[PDB]
Symmetry: C4
Subunit: 394 residues, 4 copies
């Protein structure tokens, strides 16, 4: 539809025109959208014809705005249009805020079990392990199999995500970040299961990365808290901007001076590349040692290089990072609030695709009528209107 | 009154209309408020009818503006209105600046005694302790009983605060912060008295938290110094904003990677959760050790996790904190000055509720007359006016 | 020409007038520049007479704008003029982006060879060294002679740069920075060759500085990536501004308090100037020790000086640096983007001076005609036009 | 004069009116100030009657503007007025820039001698010391007596400064900061001489503070370099603002938690107040140890206090400092440039009070005439004009 094409392109005012058109005329009130049926004292209650929600149409409007390729003009502004911008706010505060707190209650109990199942792993060699008859490790084995079940669940739900939309590996990390991470978490969980029954001890590597990834995915549920949520968006957008560009520059100076200080070292402990690449990394933390070796010639060469390193990377790049974060904070400061708004909207749509077997609340704010007039006949039983309200504005 | 209701709602211009109305008309100069009785050369001296100060009315205006729920429109701007905004400035520089410096002189001597009484506590077991006949520890015992007396005084004064206003546990930490802290300080002081006579050595835990809390409550008296005071407001508003949101994100990455590095550790010293949760906390300070253990398998897994931790939390979150403080400084930069202004106003009102037995200075800047005309008769002895002054403005 | 003189002075609107003049008139369309030959529906295709590119004229326009002394009015804005500003964009995306990625592929393989040739240097004394008959060190000797060849190549190319332009030692470090560094890198490489055959072991000092300089010159190729490139310009402009001014102030406080703490030290390890000038430098990193010696008198004097040092330089200058970077970031934030644009332009011009033996692509976007009218006769075969395009603008 | 009273009050436009008045009229060109005697093509050369420089009048204008109490309206803007603002620029670039570089060349050689005289002090007890007949320590004794001579010179020049102006102990540290420091440096130098002949070894305390103070006074000569000079003004204004207010807040939390952690410590090394007040100070540097003692009860109490300390002062105050510096940088960013301008002006005036015995250059840019007309008679030999020049402005 040209409605959906105005959305799927991102033409912003056109969509404001369509969703709010007004006509008090015979054979044309059936052409109008915004039905100001209660124009009482200053609150202007209005009703909206609502072919936009996904329960109405197939390939409907909100799924179009939410699932876009993020190369559109302003996808983060088309949710601000007055019929939609309270329809989600209704659906959240009425319906999905209950079930969203539920999953975050489940997922917090998923990680605590997966924590304690890993914290009390057995130390003896050769996996897998015969469960002892003591009543303690039955909790371990139940804790083990519960935690694998989450790795199963996030595996299919990661797939049946991607088996729908197919973001084609360029929109994948671009917009659908932190949906990859739940898949990658589950992916490490299954490789840990594979090696646990293929008897090799290296499963616990895969268990560990599945666990550190898992706790950091508890930042996902900071959406649904607009204080925390907009904050966590900035943490995403600083990683995808100030780590691909910062850590290239830092690794040049690191791996540059780390190489120049190897070849100066004649022999001894730090004569490998790796063991001195830590020792120059410790300067960045704040544990750098200036006299961390002596087995070389030309001490003046050695301490010019450390001082050329520490000046360039500790007091100059790491302070340049704090600047360029702060200069890029103010730009993101309003745009990230928009990205929060859209991420809640995806969670709202994702649950109606989930909670479809109980779809009595799938409609929003009216299904009866607001028209009562059509050129083809009666219109007092259709157009499934949404009751709204308004302010004074004198 | 509609005057008080304009204040208690926070309607800002309405209150500017009421406190400054002007009428030079028969039967209506008794209806006017602002009496420009000396409209001389450019300084325009004026007198104000003053039913606003608390000595005039019951449930009067300044107590309404000060004790609000902070969900009002602009409580921090209704003190800027010209009759009030110099009336407090008069009351401070005339009356309460003397007594405010007194209490801060007392409280500084309260803490020094409570310091030295704790610094010279006896080391021998089994509290309480028989006072030796040497003349030294009589100063200790007097120092002990003086310091408990402050714990008594701040206990009732914390209660008889709350027994008046009842901020109902939501406005409590919101606006009446740093009045809780004096109550919590005294609360730890009394539990320390309880355990000191119930013979258990754990009283000194309660003494210590009563002491660290006590010295940090010496920031309370930075109000009354507009240099220091506005500064200390920013320290409050960054804690109540950038610690509930920062320390959630930090504790995720901490307790995430702290768990992932436990289960990698096979056995030894750091195989507990707590002992490695310090070792990852030391990276935040600047004392983090990269090779702080060796008793594991898969060294590459271990040092990916530290490097994934240090990149994410030491060079990225802790620099993001400095950004988001600075982006939120400029917003607070003017608003905190308003919050300082209102906190002085509460201290001004709180002392007239205290120093009521000597209430000769409880009136402000005139009680005689400025009207001399009323429709009901004479008006040359009432309306308790406040003498003001003005500038040129050509 | 007055065209070139408008460029070489930096008069900005004059150059916009010349490169875009329009005339539809007999005996005067041969005087016009901008030939709007396809004024179709909203895209306005236009053709440009193009005496500006260096293949047309000797001492031509882009070489004038690029090779300026940087004391001009806005050299970083004269490349924004519509004929040029897409002509380079054409030449990059058509021609030189291929060869620029090639050299950065070569130079990355140059450094890896020069890395491994240094990483596996022999430890035995008395250079030079007889190559063993084992097949391993033939890779070393080939790696050695390949790496010297780069030192030869960057030596002449550094000279035949300077043998052209002669920036006269004031414009040298000012604008032609990071062209010096490739010369200085090669310069250390040759001194390393000299000492390697003059049998003294101090060649490896010169090898090392040639190597740390070499990896940091891999930041040169961040131009050609507008994300990374504008970022790396800021790293240049903060060094040439906030190191000549910061490190003077820091070295005053360093060498001040380092001297005042020597003379307090009576005898022992740290009684030299250098050994305590490190110990006060360690405070800047985060490894400063407050009790790092005891062999003095007047401990209170010693720890006042450290605390006077640490207050003044660790919590006050190093936080002042982060401020004054960030206050100077916003000023540079747009200007550095312009300096990136001009640095790409120099690389574009530098390759046509290089790739001249294959100059079939040396022309840009047309050589045939756009005029077809002249007062002296025919004009349908000259003026070597550049086909452009445009937008709608209603 | 009303001219001087317009300056000494700081009325800014009035002074612009007086110094630039124009009259082409009989009996009134002798009343005019700005004589536009060469109104040629676009450069408008002009001459100025110049009763403003101190060689003309007693209690003259520049000494009034420079020596103000800094409670004036805009003392940092009255030097921007067109006759003055190039007159100092003339006097600097013609006359005093030569002698200013001289003193900074002397003072740099003063400190190097005073450095080496202290660096090679004798270690043997009981001052003073018999000079050995070896030729080495004659350089020491000459170095000693040269360095005392600077302590003599800065003593009187510090006094005969103050014996003129008498800033009355409130304007002293306010505006005449870094003139105190040269007096305090010399003051420590003389006390070091006193104790060196009163045979007590504690002179070297006074020598040391005289030396660390001395090198940091080499920041004084950063005026005269407008790059470095404006930078060094910011270092002054951040100390006098963000140390009286920061270090109060920090010392509360320091001395608060340092006391609360003493009384928890039962006995041992750190059971003194001072020895643990360092250990909590080390957290601010980056060398804080969390397990720095064990001799207590209630470990959980001990590490809550460190973590309550480190959260509050290391990641929260020290990041709040970087914010509030940067928010106060932008405000100072233009005002400090004005304070630089005025500090050069004081140095210009201070040398004519010094170099008065050679006062042939004490006049500025003309003494002959520009009037040639007066109501009382001839005016072709007075009013000591200053030749200026101008720009085009079409
Ligand atoms: O919306 C989201 C935000 C965030 C996350 C997830 C969201 O859905 C978590 N996150 C994480 S875990 N970054 C780190 C990845 C990582 C972890 C461990 C290893 Cl060993 C290697 C790499 C990054 C940003 C915060
Ligand atoms: O207006 C006020 C401002 C301030 C305060 C009081 C005011 O009235 C003091 N303050 C403190 S003490 N924060 C820390 C609380 C704390 C202390 C110790 C422990 Cl072991 C646990 C928690 C926070 C902010 C500064
Ligand atoms: O455009 C460019 C940017 C950059 C560079 C080159 C460019 O062409 C590299 N660079 C370097 S290497 N700075 C350090 C110099 C240095 C290195 C080692 C020693 Cl021992 C002494 C001095 C500085 C800035 C980054
Ligand atoms: O215009 C000027 C600027 C500056 C200065 C002098 C100027 O004339 C030097 N300065 C110094 S030395 N601050 C520190 C004082 C100090 C030193 C040592 C001890 Cl042990 C105790 C106190 C502060 C600011 C920089």
């Amino acid at each position: 539809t040209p409605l959906a094409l105005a959305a799927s392109s991102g033409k912003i005012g056109v969509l404001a025109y369509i969703l709010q058109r007004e006509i008090h005329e015979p054979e044309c009130r059936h052409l109008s959208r915004k039905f100001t049926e209660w124009a009482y004292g200053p609150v202007h209650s209005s009703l909206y014809d609502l072919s936009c929600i996904d329960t109405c149409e197939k390939n409907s409007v909100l799924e179009v705005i939410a699932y876009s390729s993020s190369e559109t003009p302003n996808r983060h502004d088309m949710l601000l249009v007055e019929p939609l911008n309270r329809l989600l706010q209704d659906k959240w505060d009425r319906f999905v805020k209950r079930i969203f707190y539920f999953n975050f209650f489940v997922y917090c109990l998923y990680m605590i079990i997966f924590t304690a199942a890993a914290y009390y792993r057995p130390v003896e060699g050769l996996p897998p392990y015969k469960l002892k008859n003591t009543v303690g490790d039955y909790f371990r084995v139940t804790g083990e199999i519960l935690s694998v079940s989450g790795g199963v669940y996030f595996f299919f739900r990661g797939i049946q995500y991607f088996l729908q939309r197919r973001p084609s590996l360029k929109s994948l990390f671009v917009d659908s970040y932190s949906e990859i991470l739940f898949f990658v978490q589950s992916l490490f969980m299954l490789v840990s299961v594979v090696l646990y029954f293929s008897q090799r001890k290296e499963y616990v590597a895969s268990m560990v990365f599945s666990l550190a990834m898992g706790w950091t995915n508890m930042l996902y549920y900071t959406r649904g808290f607009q204080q925390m949520g907009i904050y966590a968006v900035m943490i995403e957008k600083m990683i995808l901007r100030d780590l691909c560009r910062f850590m290239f520059v830092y690794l040049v100076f690191l791996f540059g001076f780390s190489t120049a200080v190897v070849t100066l070292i004649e022999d001894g402990k730090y004569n490998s590349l790796y063991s001195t690449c830590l020792e120059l990394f410790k300067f960045t933390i704040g544990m750098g040692d200036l006299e961390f070796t002596e087995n070389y010639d030309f001490k003046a060469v050695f301490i010019i290089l450390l001082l050329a390193y520490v000046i360039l990377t500790y007091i100059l790049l790491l302070n340049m990072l704090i600047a360029l974060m702060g200069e890029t904070v103010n730009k993101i400061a309003q745009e990230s609030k928009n990205i929060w708004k859209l991420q809640r909207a995806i969670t709202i749509l994702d649950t109606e695709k989930s909670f479809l077997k109980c779809m009595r609340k799938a409609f929003r704010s009216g299904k009866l009528l607001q028209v009562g007039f059509t050129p083809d006949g009666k219109d007092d039983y259709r157009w499934c209107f949404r009751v709204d309200e308004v302010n004074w504005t004198t």
